[PDB]
From a paper:
Amyloid-forming proteins such α-synuclein and tau, which are implicated in Alzheimer’s and Parkinson’s disease, can form different fibril structures or strains with distinct toxic properties, seeding activities and pathology. Here we report that O-GlcNAc modification of α-synuclein monomers results in the formation of amyloid fibril with distinct core structure, as revealed by cryogenic electron microscopy, and diminished seeding activity in seeding-based neuronal and rodent models of Parkinson’s disease.
We focused on O-GlcNAc modification at S87, termed α-syn(gS87), because this modification site displays the least inhibition of α-syn fibril formation, thus providing an opportunity to obtain homogeneously O-GlcNAc-modified fibrils for detailed analysis. We subjected α-syn(gS87) to aggregation and used TEM and cryo-EM to visualize fibrils, revealing various fibril morphologies, including double, triple and quadruple filaments comprised of two, three and four protofilaments, respectively. The resulting density map, with a resolution of 4.97 Å, corresponded to a crossover of 1,221 Å, an optimized twist angle of −0.7° (assumed to be left handed), and a helical rise of 4.92 Å. Modeling structures at this limited resolution cannot necessarily define molecular features, but the density map could fit a reasonable α-syn(gS87) model comprising the residues from glycine 7 to lysine 96 and an extra density corresponding to the sugar on serine 87. This analysis shows several salt bridges potentially holding together the two protofilaments (sb1) and contributing to the folding of the α-syn(gS87) fiber structure (sb2, sb3 and sb4). The electron density confirms that α-syn(gS87) fibrils are quite different from both the pathogenic unmodified fibrils we prepared here and the amyloids isolated from patient brains to date, and our structural model potentially explains how O-GlcNAc statically forces a different fold. In the full-length fibrils, O-GlcNAc is stable against removal by OGA. This is consistent with its position in the core of the fibril structure, which would be unlikely to be dynamic enough to bind in the required extended conformation to the OGA active site.
Author numbering:
A (entry chain D), B (entry chain E), C (entry chain F), D (entry chain C), E (entry chain A), F (entry chain B): 7 to 96
Write the structure that this text describes.
Amino acid sequence: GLSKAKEGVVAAAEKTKQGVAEAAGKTKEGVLYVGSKTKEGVVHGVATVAEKTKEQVTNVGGAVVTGVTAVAQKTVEGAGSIAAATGFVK
Amino acid sequence: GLSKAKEGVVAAAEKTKQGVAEAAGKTKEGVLYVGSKTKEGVVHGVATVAEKTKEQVTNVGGAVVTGVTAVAQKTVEGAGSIAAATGFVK
Amino acid sequence: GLSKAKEGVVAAAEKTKQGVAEAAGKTKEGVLYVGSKTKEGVVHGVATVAEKTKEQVTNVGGAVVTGVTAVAQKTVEGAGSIAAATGFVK
Amino acid sequence: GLSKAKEGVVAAAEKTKQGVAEAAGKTKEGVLYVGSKTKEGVVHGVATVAEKTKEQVTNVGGAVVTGVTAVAQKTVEGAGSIAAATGFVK
Amino acid sequence: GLSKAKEGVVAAAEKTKQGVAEAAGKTKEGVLYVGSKTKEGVVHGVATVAEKTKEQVTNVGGAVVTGVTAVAQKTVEGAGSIAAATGFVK
Amino acid sequence: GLSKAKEGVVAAAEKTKQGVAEAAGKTKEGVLYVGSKTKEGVVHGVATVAEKTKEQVTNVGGAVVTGVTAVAQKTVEGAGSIAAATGFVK
Ligand SMILES: *[C@@H]1O[C@H](CO)[C@@H](O)[C@H](O)[C@H]1NC(C)=O
Ligand SMILES: *[C@@H]1O[C@H](CO)[C@@H](O)[C@H](O)[C@H]1NC(C)=O
Ligand SMILES: *[C@@H]1O[C@H](CO)[C@@H](O)[C@H](O)[C@H]1NC(C)=O
Ligand SMILES: *[C@@H]1O[C@H](CO)[C@@H](O)[C@H](O)[C@H]1NC(C)=O
Ligand SMILES: *[C@@H]1O[C@H](CO)[C@@H](O)[C@H](O)[C@H]1NC(C)=O
Ligand SMILES: *[C@@H]1O[C@H](CO)[C@@H](O)[C@H](O)[C@H]1NC(C)=O
């Protein structure tokens, strides 16, 4: 049983996931040895991310703007009236 | 049983996740030895992130602006009226 | 049983997570030896993050602005009227 | 009389020049005004050089190696036995 | 009479020059005004050099290595036996 | 008579020059006004050099190594036996 990121063993579940990201190297798992070694061994890793990320955001005279939003709800027996990143203009 | 990030063993669950991030190297797990070693061994890792992240945010005369928001609710038997990152203009 | 970040063993749960971050190297777990070693061993790690993060935020004459918000509620049998990062303009 | 780099007025001369370089903008001379100006004037300049110059030099078991050398000599009436960047192997 | 770099007025001369360099902007000369100005004037300059110059030099088991050398001699009536960056191996 | 760097007025001369350098902006000369000005004037300059210059020098088991050397001699009537950056191995 090895789960790197989210779930390994569940009977019932539900999820929501988002990503605005930058990654070089993940997931170096299960490095296990059963036996014998005699002379030499070498392991090596190098990572480099996000070299000069240049970005500009401009918004003039807008009404509604939404960048990132994640909503997840579970109801067994009920009423739900929920909202997120909502904008009312009149 | 090894879960790196979120969940290893659950009977019932629900989650929401977001990321605005930068990462070089994660998840170096399960490095276990069962046996014998004689002469030499070397392990090595290097990480570098977020080299000169240049960014500007500008908003002039706006009405509603929403950058990042995460909402997750669970109800068994009830009424729920919730909100987040909401804006009312009149 | 080893859970690095959030949960290892739960019967029922629910969570919400957010990140605006920068990381070089995480998750070096399970480094356990069962056996014998004779001559030499070396382990090495280097991390570097957040090299000259330059950023500007400007907001002039706005009405509603929301950067980051996380809300998570659980109700068994009840009424809930909650809000966060809300703005009313009239 | 305006000489930017090497010589403006000479009766007798001799020179030697070398360059291993990188340059964006030179030689903005002779900006002189004779007259009148009334309302507005703008002058602007931007320069950027040497973006991530990556280079490696390797030499194994060599005998003679010469990278850069400049020699210039002037004699009126005489004997000259000069040398530079010379290598004798026996 | 304006000489930026080397020589403006000479009767007899001799020189040697070398460069391993990086430059953004030089030579903004002769900015002189003869007259009248009324309302506005702006002058502007920006320079940036040597962005992440990465370099390695390696030499193993060599005999003679010469990187940079400049020699210049002038003799009226005489004998000259000079040397520079020389290597004798026997 | 204005000489920025080396020589403005000489009857007889000789020189040698070298550079391993990095420069953003030089040579802002001759800014002289003859006349009248009424309302406004602005002069501006910005310079930035040597951003993360990373370099390594390695030499193992060498015989002769010469990086930088400059020699210049003048003799009217004589004998000269001079040397620089020389290496004798036997
Ligand atoms: C649910 O939310 C809405 C508004 O979005 C509201 O009008 C309603 O009364 C709430 N409940 C039900 C059962 O509609
Ligand atoms: C839920 O929230 C809404 C407003 O968004 C409100 O009008 C309502 O009365 C609340 N409850 C129900 C059952 O609608
Ligand atoms: C829930 O909140 C809303 C306002 O958002 C309010 O009008 C309402 O009375 C509250 N309760 C119910 C059952 O609606
Ligand atoms: C000049 O230099 C050489 C060696 O390069 C030497 O043999 C000689 O004697 C010197 N002078 C003359 C006149 O040759
Ligand atoms: C000049 O230098 C050389 C060695 O390079 C030497 O043998 C010689 O005697 C010197 N003078 C003359 C006239 O050769
Ligand atoms: C000049 O230097 C050389 C050695 O480089 C030497 O042998 C010589 O005697 C000196 N003078 C003359 C005239 O050669």
